[PDB]
Amino acid sequence: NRDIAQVVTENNKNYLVLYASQTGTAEDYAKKFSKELVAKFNLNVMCADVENYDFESLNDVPVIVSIFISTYGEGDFPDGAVNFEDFICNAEAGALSNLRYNMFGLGNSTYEFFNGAAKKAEKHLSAAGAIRLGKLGEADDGAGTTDEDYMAWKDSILEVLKDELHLDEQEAKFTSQFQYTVLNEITDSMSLGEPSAHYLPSHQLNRNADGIQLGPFDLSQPYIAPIVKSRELFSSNDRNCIHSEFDLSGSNIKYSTGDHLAVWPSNPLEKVEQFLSIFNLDPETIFDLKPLDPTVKVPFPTPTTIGAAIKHYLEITGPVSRQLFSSLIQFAPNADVKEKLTLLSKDKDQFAVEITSKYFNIADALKYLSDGAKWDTVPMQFLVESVPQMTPRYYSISSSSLSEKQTVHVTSIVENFPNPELPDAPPVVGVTTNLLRNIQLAQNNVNIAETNLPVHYDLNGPRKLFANYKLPVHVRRSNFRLPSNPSTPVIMIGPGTGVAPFRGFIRERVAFLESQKKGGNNVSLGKHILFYGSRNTDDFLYQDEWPEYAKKLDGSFEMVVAHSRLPNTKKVYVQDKLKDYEDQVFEMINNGAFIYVCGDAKGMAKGVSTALVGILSRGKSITTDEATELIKMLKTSGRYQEDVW
Numbered sequence: 004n005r006d007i008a009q010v011v012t013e014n015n016k017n018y019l020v021l022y023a024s025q026t027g028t029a030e031d032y033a034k035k036f037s038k039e040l041v042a043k044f045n046l047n048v049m050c051a052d053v054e055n056y057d058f059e060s061l062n063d064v065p066v067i068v069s070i071f072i073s074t075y076g077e078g079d080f081p082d083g084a085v086n087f088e089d090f091i092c093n094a095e096a097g098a099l100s101n102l103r104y105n106m107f108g109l110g111n112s113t114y115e116f117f118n119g120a121a122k123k124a125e126k127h128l129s130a131a132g133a134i135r136l137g138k139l140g141e142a143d144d145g146a147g148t149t150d151e152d153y154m155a156w157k158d159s160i161l162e163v164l165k166d167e168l169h170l171d172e173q174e175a176k177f178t179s180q181f182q183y184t185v186l187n188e189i190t191d192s193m194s195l196g197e198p199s200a201h202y203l204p205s206h207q208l209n210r211n212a213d214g215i216q217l218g219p220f221d222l223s224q225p226y227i228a229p230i231v232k233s234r235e236l237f238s239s240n241d242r243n244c245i246h247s248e249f250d251l252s253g254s255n256i257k258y259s260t261g262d263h264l265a266v267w268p269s270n271p272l273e274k275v276e277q278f279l280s281i282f283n284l285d286p287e288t289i290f291d292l293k294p295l296d297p298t299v300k301v302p303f304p305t306p307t308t309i310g311a312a313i314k315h316y317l318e319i320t321g322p323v324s325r326q327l328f329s330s331l332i333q334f335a336p337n338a339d340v341k342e343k344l345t346l347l348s349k350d351k352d353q354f355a356v357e358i359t360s361k362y363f364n365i366a367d368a369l370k371y372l373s374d375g376a377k378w379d380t381v382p383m384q385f386l387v388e389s390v391p392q393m394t395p396r397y398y399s400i401s402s403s404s405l406s407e408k409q410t411v412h413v414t415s416i417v418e419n420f421p422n423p424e425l426p427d428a429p430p431v432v433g434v435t436t437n438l439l440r441n442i443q444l445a446q447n448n449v450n451i452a453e454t455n456l457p458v459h460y461d462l463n464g465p466r467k468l469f470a471n472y473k474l475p476v477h478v479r480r481s482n483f484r485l486p487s488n489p490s491t492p493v494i495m496i497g498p499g500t501g502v503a504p505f506r507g508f509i510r511e512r513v514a515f516l517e518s519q520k521k522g523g524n525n526v527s528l529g530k531h532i533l534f535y536g537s538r539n540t541d542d543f544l545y546q547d548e549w550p551e552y553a554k555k556l557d558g559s560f561e562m563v564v565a566h567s568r569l570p571n572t573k574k575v576y577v578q579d580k581l582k583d584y585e586d587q588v589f590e591m592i593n594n595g596a597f598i599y600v601c602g603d604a605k606g607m608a609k610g611v612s613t614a615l616v617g618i619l620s621r622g623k624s625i626t627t628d629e630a631t632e633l634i635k636m637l638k639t640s641g642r643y644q645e646d647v648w
């Protein structure tokens with residue numbers, strides 16, 4: 004039941020496809036592979052999330068295995084795949100001499116340890132005597148080539164397995180892993196979009212004496228929390244960034260400054276409409292999915308309505324995979340479209356030209372090819388097994404648990420920019436962030452008609468479960484933590500929203516410092532310096548707060564702002580400011596300071612790291628390489644932590 008070799012064998016599976024995915028990217032591609040493997044060779048494949056099984060009996064797997072692994076933190080596996088990571092990192096020599104596998108690693112060359120998880124995993128597997136079929140795939144999210152990278156690796160591996168297994172191909176045809184059934188009435192056991200099944204009327208939320216909602220809150224059961232306060236942090240007529248405050252008192256959730264919050268979204272109504280239209284799906288359709296074997300896991304709560312699935316369960320928005328096109332050939336509206344489609348699925352570049360570059364969503368791509376002709380022969384099952392599952396988006400909590408124990412602050416910059424290719428098309432927006440903004444405007448009685456809100460969301464939720472200004476949520480414990488000793492110096496680097504953690508960090512230090520003031524015994528606070536950065540004065544996050552914080556922390560605090568887009572001057576980054584203050588920074592580091600790097604970036608991570616290596620290199624008068632080794636050490640020990648996304 005958790006005994007991998009046993010599960011495979013008992014269910015007579017010909018192939019095993021494992022995946023270690025944090026955000027689900029690895030999982031979805033794993034599914035794409037599995038589906039195609041069934042479509043072309045009718046193999047009875049097993050899709051498993053590496054986290055749900057015990058790989059002790061891995062060397063007893065009579066079938067070939069495909070491993071899809073992502074890289075996080077250092078060159079390490081996704082949280083909750085460490086068990087797997089350890090079985091591997093501990094498997095002795097010859098411990099997996101029967102294992103035959105191929106692996107596709109998902110990473111991003113913008114980080115040091117690019118695809119290191121897959122690499123580590125490939126090094127230990129071969130160490131235990133496992134034979135590796137085909138080339139080690141490496142999807143580079145940094146170059147935005149992940150989908151094509153997969154297509155490339157995919158095609159070559161399938162050839163290999165065709166040989167290795169002596170399989171006879173066949174025209175690719177879809178085969179549901181479920182038993183689709185169309186119901187007629189809606190029960191209390193049927194979902195209208197509720198997150199986990201526990202929120203279905205016919206189910207009882209597990210609380211305590213005082214009604215406080217209990218149970219563990221994670222990806223398999225969020226906690227619907229209300230956003231009690233919300234405001235705009237920017238003052239730019241093009242960009243927005245929202246400050247959201249979540250009340251967690253109605254639950255036994257505890258968070259530590261430095262943790263992450265996962266916000267479960269829903270789709271923009273105007274996109275839900277586009278999807279439902281191009282296919283010609285009736286929202287009111289009630290359906291149920293019945294697995295065709297124990298290995299198969301229903302995607303979301305069922306039965307449910309088509310419109311609920313498309314609004315709360317499927318990622319109908321985002322870049323269309325070329326593989327989707329290939330899989331859509333079976334249900335082309337007409338011979339015409341079927342041909343155009345066929346071509347695009349095969350031509351890497353034409354696909355990018357006709358679809359990708361225009362920022363299409365499935366709805367758009369298809370409507371583009373059909374010229375409006377609906378794709379009314381596409382099965383909801385296919386759509387369910389073929390469209391990526393919606394997934395929570397994470398945020399660096401910007402509140403202090405010591406001064407907010409029950410409340411959680413989130414600093415999300417809204418994603419919404421003009422289509423670079425189509426000057427008349429709608430903006431390219433992000434679900435969650437625009438959703439958070441919608442709630443923000445709403446909650447504040449802002450006339451959203453005037454605003455630049457590009458889309459809008461169902462703010463009531465399923466059965467009004469989202470009781471105005473509420474959303475499924477769950478805390479994700481991290482390692483980003485302030486030093487134990489208050490005296491230890493601290494260095495915080497966070498461009499843009501990357502300052503979120505640091506706001507909490509400072510709020511923690513400021514809160515703490517208060518307590519000491521009502522207890523006499525004062526502890527001297529080590530030096531705390533912050534390097535922040537933003538375009539101009541309109542995107543200067545929590546501008547008003549820092550001066551107050553500074554007053555309460557006195558000389559223990561120091562902020563260094565940099566602006567990359569002020570008119571008439573030269574673009575300045577935090578790494579630039581790091582070199583300006585190299586003496587201060589070097590000194591602090593020689594005093595055991597801790598280095599914190601947070602934010603999005605695409606570059607900033609290595610940039611800042613490189614800056615420090617320079618500072619160190621000059622400071623201790625050693626080579627760049629030595630200094631690089633010293634920096635790697637500070638990261639291994641934990642004196643240099645990074646929360647870069």
Ligand SMILES: Cc1cc2nc3c(=O)[nH]c(=O)nc-3n(C[C@H](O)[C@H](O)[C@H](O)COP(=O)(O)OP(=O)(O)OC[C@H]3O[C@@H](n4cnc5c(N)ncnc54)[C@H](O)[C@@H]3O)c2cc1C
Nearest residue numbers: 321322363396397398399415416418431432433434435436
């Ligand atoms: C550990 C961690 C911490 C984080 N902390 C923060 C934080 O503090 N603050 C913060 O703001 N974010 C943070 N993030 C990022 C955040 O989780 C999301 O990535 C961000 O909010 C985008 O959410 P969304 O719902 O708008 O994205 P999505 O809807 O998934 O959209 C992503 C992007 O793709 C674009 N897009 C949409 N459709 C298409 C298409 N068809 N083709 C191409 N592009 C398309 C969107 O416009 C958008 O820019 C963090 C992430 C992690 C993993």
Ligand SMILES: Cc1cc2nc3c(=O)[nH]c(=O)nc-3n(C[C@H](O)[C@H](O)[C@H](O)COP(=O)(O)O)c2cc1C
Nearest residue numbers: 024025026027028029073074075110111114117118
């Ligand atoms: C917090 C965070 C840390 C990451 N660290 C690395 C890293 O060290 N190396 C790398 O190659 N990619 C890194 N990535 C990129 C992911 O591996 C990549 O986006 C992958 O597609 C994620 O797949 P998943 O969604 O299946 O987990 C990181 C991503 C995030 C969000």
Ligand SMILES: Cc1cc2nc3c(=O)[nH]c(=O)nc-3n(C[C@H](O)[C@H](O)[C@H](O)COP(=O)(O)O)c2cc1C
Nearest residue numbers: 026027028031144147149150322323324325359391
């Ligand atoms: C053309 C194209 C198609 C893609 N198709 C998919 C897809 O079907 N499934 C998936 O998980 N990622 C797909 N990706 C990858 C995402 O764009 C990318 O990994 C992004 O970081 C995901 O962010 P998320 O965390 O919001 O999923 C595709 C990328 C491109 C460029």
